[PDB]
Design a protein around this nucleic acid. Sequence first.
RNA 1: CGAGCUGGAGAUACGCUUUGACUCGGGGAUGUCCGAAUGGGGAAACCCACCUCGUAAGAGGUAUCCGCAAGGAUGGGAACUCAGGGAACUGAAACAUCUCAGUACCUGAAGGAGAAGAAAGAGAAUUCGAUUCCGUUAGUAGCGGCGAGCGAACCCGGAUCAGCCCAAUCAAGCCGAAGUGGCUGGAAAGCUACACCUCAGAAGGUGAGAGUCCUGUAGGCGAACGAGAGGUCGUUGUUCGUGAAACGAUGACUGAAUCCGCGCGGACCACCGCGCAAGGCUAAAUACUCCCAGUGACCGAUAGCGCAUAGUACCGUGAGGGAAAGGUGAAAAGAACCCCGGGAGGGGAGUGAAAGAGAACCUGAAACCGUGGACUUACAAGCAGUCAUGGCACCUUAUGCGUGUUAUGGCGUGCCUAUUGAAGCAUGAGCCGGCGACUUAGACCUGACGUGCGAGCUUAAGUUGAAAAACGGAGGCGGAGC
RNA 2: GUAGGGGAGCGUUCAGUCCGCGGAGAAGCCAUACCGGAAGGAGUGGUGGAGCCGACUGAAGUGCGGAUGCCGGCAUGAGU
Lengths: 65, 110, 197, 117, 141
Amino acid sequence: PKMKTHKMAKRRIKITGTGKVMAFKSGKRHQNTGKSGDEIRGKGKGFVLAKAEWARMKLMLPRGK
Amino acid sequence: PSAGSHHNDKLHFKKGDTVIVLSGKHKGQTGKVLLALPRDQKVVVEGVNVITKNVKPSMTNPQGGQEQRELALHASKVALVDPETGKATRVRKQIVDGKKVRVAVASGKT
Amino acid sequence: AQINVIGQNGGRTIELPLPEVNSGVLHEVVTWQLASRRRGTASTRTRAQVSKTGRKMYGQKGTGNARHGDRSVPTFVGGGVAFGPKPRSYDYTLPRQVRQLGLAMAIASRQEGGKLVAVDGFDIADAKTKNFISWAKQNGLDGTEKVLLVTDDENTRRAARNVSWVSVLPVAGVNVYDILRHDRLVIDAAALEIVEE
Amino acid sequence: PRAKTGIVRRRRHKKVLKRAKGFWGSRSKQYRNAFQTLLNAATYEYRDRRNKKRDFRRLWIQRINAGARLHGMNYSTFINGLKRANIDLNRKVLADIAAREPEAFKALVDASRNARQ
Amino acid sequence: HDLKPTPGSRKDRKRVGRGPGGTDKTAGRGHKGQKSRSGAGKGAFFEGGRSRLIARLPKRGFNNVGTTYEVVKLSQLQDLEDTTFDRDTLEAYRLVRRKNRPVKLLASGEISRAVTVHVDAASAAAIKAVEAAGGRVVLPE
RNA sequence: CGAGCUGGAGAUACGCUUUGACUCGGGGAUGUCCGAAUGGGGAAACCCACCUCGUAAGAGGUAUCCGCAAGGAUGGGAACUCAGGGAACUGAAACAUCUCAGUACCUGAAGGAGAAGAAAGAGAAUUCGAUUCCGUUAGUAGCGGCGAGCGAACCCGGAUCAGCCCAAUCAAGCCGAAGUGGCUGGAAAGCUACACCUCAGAAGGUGAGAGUCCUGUAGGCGAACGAGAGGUCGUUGUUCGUGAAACGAUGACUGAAUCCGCGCGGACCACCGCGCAAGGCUAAAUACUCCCAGUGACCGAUAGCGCAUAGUACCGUGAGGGAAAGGUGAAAAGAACCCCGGGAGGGGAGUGAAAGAGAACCUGAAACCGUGGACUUACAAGCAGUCAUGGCACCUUAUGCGUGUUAUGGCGUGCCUAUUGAAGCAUGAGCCGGCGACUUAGACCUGACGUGCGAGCUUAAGUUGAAAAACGGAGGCGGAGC
RNA sequence: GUAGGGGAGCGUUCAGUCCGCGGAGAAGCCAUACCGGAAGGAGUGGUGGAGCCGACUGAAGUGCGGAUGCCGGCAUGAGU
Ligand SMILES: [Mg+2]
Ligand SMILES: [Mg+2]
Ligand SMILES: [Mg+2]
Ligand SMILES: [Mg+2]
Ligand SMILES: [Mg+2]
Ligand SMILES: [Mg+2]
Ligand SMILES: [Mg+2]
Ligand SMILES: [Mg+2]
Ligand SMILES: [Mg+2]
Ligand SMILES: [Mg+2]
Ligand SMILES: [Mg+2]
Ligand SMILES: [Mg+2]
Ligand SMILES: [Mg+2]
Ligand SMILES: [Mg+2]
Ligand SMILES: [Mg+2]
Ligand SMILES: [Mg+2]
Ligand SMILES: [Mg+2]
Ligand SMILES: [Mg+2]
Ligand SMILES: [Mg+2]
Ligand SMILES: [Mg+2]
Ligand SMILES: [Mg+2]
Ligand SMILES: [Mg+2]
Ligand SMILES: [Mg+2]
Ligand SMILES: [Mg+2]
Ligand SMILES: [Mg+2]
Ligand SMILES: [Mg+2]
Ligand SMILES: [Mg+2]
Ligand SMILES: [Mg+2]
Ligand SMILES: [Mg+2]
Ligand SMILES: [Mg+2]
Ligand SMILES: [Mg+2]
Ligand SMILES: [Mg+2]
Ligand SMILES: [Mg+2]
Ligand SMILES: [Mg+2]
Ligand SMILES: [Mg+2]
């Protein structure tokens, strides 16, 4: 059986050139009028997971994409 | 798993033929084929010979009584002989007449 | 780097698998080889496969007995095998270059023997084993060795075969096993100037 | 291929059992209780190698004290007596002197009470 | 029969169980627990019963395959090919085997000698540096 | 075929057979009664009739459905095929959509295959051209309480190739090379000395292991008979879960054009492309394996099928469940006869190489039961051991580091499991013997070790060969990221 | 030194090859004071009556005291 790709992880995770794993910062959908404008700015973004969380994601998409 | 199975139920000699005893205790003694059973591959030759016992039965006769009769042998200790050589001999199938198949050696025939 | 016998004597060709032949790669090639031909035909029954009804034998608690559900179980005499062999296959694809380097290194090994004997033409009358025996005898094949013969001529093979100590191989039926199995190799030689280039 | 037990289990078993002769009742005839008895035997063997070294020292000491006191001396005072006069004897040996050779042990006594004076 | 495999080619497997040698009793598995048990399952992305990291993270953007360009470098074509030239069926026989995708040329490292190239697109600084060395770049019609 | 035969059965008698038996191959004749059962009935294998011929004996006919007739159908068949109907456990660490799964099961029809098939197509090159199957694309595109998880197709490479008609050689069998002498042994195949055939050294049988003793093998011969439309509502199919939902598919209602016409191309329109629905058949590649043959790093009597045969004994009203089972000897020469006993059993004798093989018959372990002998025990508190010493005994890895056995002293809380903590009055266990538990798979993922190539590396299906392997570049991995 | 990780090995069937034994007697069984660091391994003798050891290599249905485990035989309770 070919190991399947974890379709949830498709739109939320990114493989990197070196071989680290990325995602988008969170809290941006109704936690808005908070705000602060620098939070709202800092959140829409993107960023690298701390580390412990790497193996799993890697196993989520074997193809990298 | 019958004895003839290995030898295709086939006798390499007929009844009434003379035979030399190849192997065993009666090496080389000679005799007439008195009885030959193909499927079992067993053959009687006036030379083997044992002492059998008739136990109780009042037929034949109340008392026991012992007896001297030959005990059949396994085909593979039997061979056709060759009047010249006089010895243990193989066989070739050649022809005669008038539709008869016959048996030769290295110098036919028996 | 070596001579023929009957109908010429060239053979200085063929580069060879140095340093002085390696057994490691040989091993690779041979175990692969035997693996490739295993029947993989061992087969046993498991719990699903034993003819035992699946009905519960008696009550889960009560009885005073230990608990069981079925008599088709691997802790049960006459049951299933827990972890038996089912028919499988062992045949993989060893990298080509390694098969090639192998065969090569076989010939090379048998060269430093020197148990190579390159041969041209032969001379066995018309398909007779006695004549194979005399031919062999003229070439130093006493009988005290096991010999692999490779040729494309129907009748020379047809003459060797029935000899206990000769194993007979047509064309490119060659392989590291069969070779390394035997002592002497009859190459022949016609195939050698092509199996260099 | 399959590989039965064939022969191994019985060889193991007989090994244990044959270690176990002279054991009482089932302890020498049933495998498991043999094997078991033997675990405890393990403990006892190891222990008692050390412990017999403990025991014999004891014995020597007893005898020594005895001889010491025959000639009017305690053991302890006898042994400081010996160390003082730098006589350097094993107590195994001191015991054997004490038990086997009277006059000699006597001489060591006098030497030691001298070393004490 | 003479032969032997390489030291360190073949490690003998783990036979867990088989006595106090040895991994006794529990065969690695530890004492009790769901991990101890014998069943196919958990599996791998199951944290606690909780609420999973991947499930807590925002999805971004759709998905699209689009077209992907097969990369050819300068530095490849340059230094030591001695221009056997590009064409179409020539590149393959040298080294840039793909099919099904259009070819692109990108800057890489260095340019000097002039060559004629046949790609499907290329970068600005690549056409610029290939011309400034005397070579032309061919895009299709 | 050519001398034996009279089934397993081995047992006495009768006898058959060179006028060709027995066995093998091939056709016919006979073929009671039941079972689709079909004359009517019926609790299968039994009861009762009617008609035509016949002297009676006997023979033949008497079901239902399609058809004028001829003739066809009914029933059965392990798996495999299609069709009508269609689960749940379970997974989602609860559950309802979802998943298990169109799986299990039920019914139907049919064959040695079946299905499918001759584009109102796939598709995006104005490319391809019936279907099925394998590889691959590819866990990609997509689906999804966007959770669990589900998951194509096109291209490309293979296997096999096909498209036509209608409505205005194998199955019996025969021939078939080459060795003798001495030695061990109960027995020769083994040993030994010389010797031969090999297109034949595959294999089995022969008193132990046989190329050359038998059957055979390579090779050759071989038969009279024998065989080769659209719509709306309600739904669903494929990746298709109402999603923007195309398309097919019908249950209900409704219902157009026929060539400047019609149908598609993922709402929908134009344009540009592909297509001729509503009429049928079609071999080949594919599936399966009751049966047959060959093979095996499959099993050899708790193994392997449940069976060294039995769906039996046995259990159950029934559906249904369901065992254990093996071995004299080379050859029955299967122990005449004598002794004790009603017999059973045994002791002789005799046979045998061996009865240290006697029919409760290969080896014959352990638990467990006894006889005999050594040293020992009737003032003793004990997880039975262990250490130390003394006594007796014994001398084939043995006169010392001894072997057996003991007296007395010191010391000592069974094993396993589970636990903070086990001698525990916590779990398991009568005993010994056997069976008994971390494996397999994928051409998946990720490391360690090793090997081959190395800026390159590799093939898969398959093709051919096959006492081997070689081809096969389709594909896949590196090569650039964001 | 418990869970656990790591390392070097012992023994079992089957397989390839090499060595080689075996009716002046194999495997199996039985006794034993010898050998090896341990799994274990030999020597001799008794049994048995036809097959088998050692070495290297390969593949496993490969090692038992437990599971109120399974099949089987035989104990206890009891001359009750
Ligand atoms: Mg059985
Ligand atoms: Mg101390
Ligand atoms: Mg370990
Ligand atoms: Mg345990
Ligand atoms: Mg536990
Ligand atoms: Mg716990
Ligand atoms: Mg006949
Ligand atoms: Mg009727
Ligand atoms: Mg439920
Ligand atoms: Mg659930
Ligand atoms: Mg039917
Ligand atoms: Mg609808
Ligand atoms: Mg649907
Ligand atoms: Mg429609
Ligand atoms: Mg047995
Ligand atoms: Mg009697
Ligand atoms: Mg006694
Ligand atoms: Mg008292
Ligand atoms: Mg007393
Ligand atoms: Mg507690
Ligand atoms: Mg603990
Ligand atoms: Mg207690
Ligand atoms: Mg207790
Ligand atoms: Mg408890
Ligand atoms: Mg109890
Ligand atoms: Mg590496
Ligand atoms: Mg330690
Ligand atoms: Mg072997
Ligand atoms: Mg054996
Ligand atoms: Mg037990
Ligand atoms: Mg109980
Ligand atoms: Mg029992
Ligand atoms: Mg009484
Ligand atoms: Mg009582
Ligand atoms: Mg009473």
